[PDB]
Design a protein around this ligand. Structure first.
Ligand code: ATP
Ligand code: MG
Length: 415
């Protein structure tokens, strides 16, 4: 989608004014912020800048869905605490926009770090349309125009360091008129890690995608679909169908009805574009979809207990996966090998997970991140992760995919 060499650790600052759109979203107990994972990242940019000696340092919010009621408190007082503790320099939380008080505060107290906003000022969104159900309405133009003007209001250089403004727009990624587009190391890492497989990386581009089911499932497919190294490990029932015939025929009949043409089709292009897509042949299937009463065999035999096929990546599947796994190429992993969360029908899967991460070094760098996999990662244990956990399980992917990426576009290379 682009993101060549935007900018990082490039901004010189120096008695300059810095506004940072970070990753400030956490649980919601009292204040007791359950999880500091998101906050930790902020630190490289946050600290570097925090002290460099600008004069500013406004680090924006973003965590919650102030649905029905208004701007409702449940702000970020505790977080400041988190910030204060880490920094030990003093963090002040004011307004996400203005407040006569707002313009005043930033200016007043020399160098500091101010965390303000989120999506309280229904202005960082685009109101919950569809009439009936929940009140208010989408739409809105200039009013937003003012908010944006107001927001930039006290800045110099704006640094995005979250996977938000790369699909949509939303506050902290647009309005912030005035040049200077600086992207935290985090953004930088993705683009770079993420960015190149995209370029001309020799080390093949060896591609690992588990489980069937599409959604952009399908969406996922086309973009992942174009690349470099023609190695994709995708496990689908029809493909199986497409590939041969009988497996599908007794197995059953239908996968993703649309997916059937598209899949055979995309798949074809894939051969042409690169070469090889690696599927099962050995699968394990059990009475229901759940996790109980299970059978593992290779290939042929399905029907009643099914109508799509078996489920989790089994022995055969494991090896091949592992098999390709061992073989340079970069390794990108989206969703579960399958149903990785229903033990029994989530074993081989870990098996795959291990080499990739392990390899990262050996083999080659590993970029896997999302939601489903994320779980996979946490449960198995990233432990060295060695590549990319591309948070924005979804956002990244589309992103991953090659689309333009909105937030990202805003970024150029400082200037
Ligand atoms: N062979 C399979 N047997 C059973 N369930 C499967 C199988 N393959 C895939 N699934 C389902 O597909 C999911 C795999 O993850 P999925 O394909 O949804 O990843 P993704 O689309 O890249 O990311 P996501 O889960 O956030 O947004 C499993 O969690 C499971 O619900
Ligand atoms: Mg999911």
């Amino acid at each position: 989608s682009l993101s060549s060499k935007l900018s990082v650790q490039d901004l010189d600052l120096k008695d300059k004014r810095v506004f940072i759109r970070v990753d400030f979203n956490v649980p919601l107990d009292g204040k007791k912020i359950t999880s500091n994972q998101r906050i930790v990242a902020a630190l490289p940019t946050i600290k570097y800048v925090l002290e460099h000696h600008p004069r500013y340092v406004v680090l924006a919010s973003h965590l919650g869905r102030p649905n029905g009621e208004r701007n409702e408190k449940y702000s970020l007082a505790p977080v400041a605490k988190e910030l204060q503790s880490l920094l030990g320099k003093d963090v002040t939380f004011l307004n996400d926009c203005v407040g006569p008080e707002v313009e005043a505060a930033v200016k007043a107290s020399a160098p500091g770090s101010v965390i303000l906003l989120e999506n309280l000022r229904y202005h960082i969104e685009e109101e919950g349309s569809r009439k009936v159900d929940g009140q208010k309405v989408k739409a809105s133009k200039e009013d937003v125009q003012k908010f944006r003007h107001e927001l930039s209001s006290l800045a110099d250089v704006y640094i995005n360091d979250a996977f938000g403004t790369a699909h949509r727009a939303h506050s902290s990624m647009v309005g912030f008129d005035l040049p200077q587009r600086a992207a935290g190391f985090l953004l930088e890492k993705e683009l770079k890690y993420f960015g190149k497989a995209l370029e001309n990386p020799t080390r093949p581009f060896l591609a690992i995608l588990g489980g069937a089911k599409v959604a952009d499932k399908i969406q996922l497919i086309d973009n992942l679909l174009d690349k470099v190294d023609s190695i994709i490990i995708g496990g689908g029932m029809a493909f199986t169908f497409k590939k041969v015939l009988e497996n599908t025929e007794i197995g059953d009949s239908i996968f993703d009805k649309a997916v059937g043409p598209e899949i055979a089709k995309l798949m074809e292009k894939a051969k042409a574009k690169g070469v090889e897509v690696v599927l099962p042949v050995d699968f394990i299937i059990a009475d229901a979809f759940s996790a109980s009463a299970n059978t593992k065999t290779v290939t042929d035999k399905e029907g009643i207990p099914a109508g799509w096929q078996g489920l989790d990546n089994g022995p055969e599947s494991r090896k091949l996966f592992a098999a390709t796994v061992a073989k340079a190429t970069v390794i990108l992993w989206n969703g579960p090998p399958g149903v990785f969360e229903f033990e029994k029908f989530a074993a081989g899967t870990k098996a795959l997970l291990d080499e990739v991460v392990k390899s990262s070094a050996a083999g080659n760098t590993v970029i896997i991140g999302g939601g489903d996999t994320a779980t996979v990662a946490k449960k198995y244990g990233v432990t060295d992760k060695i590549s990319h956990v591309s948070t924005g399980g979804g956002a990244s992917l589309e992103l991953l995919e090659g689309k333009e990426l909105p937030g990202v576009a805003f970024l150029s290379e400082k200037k």
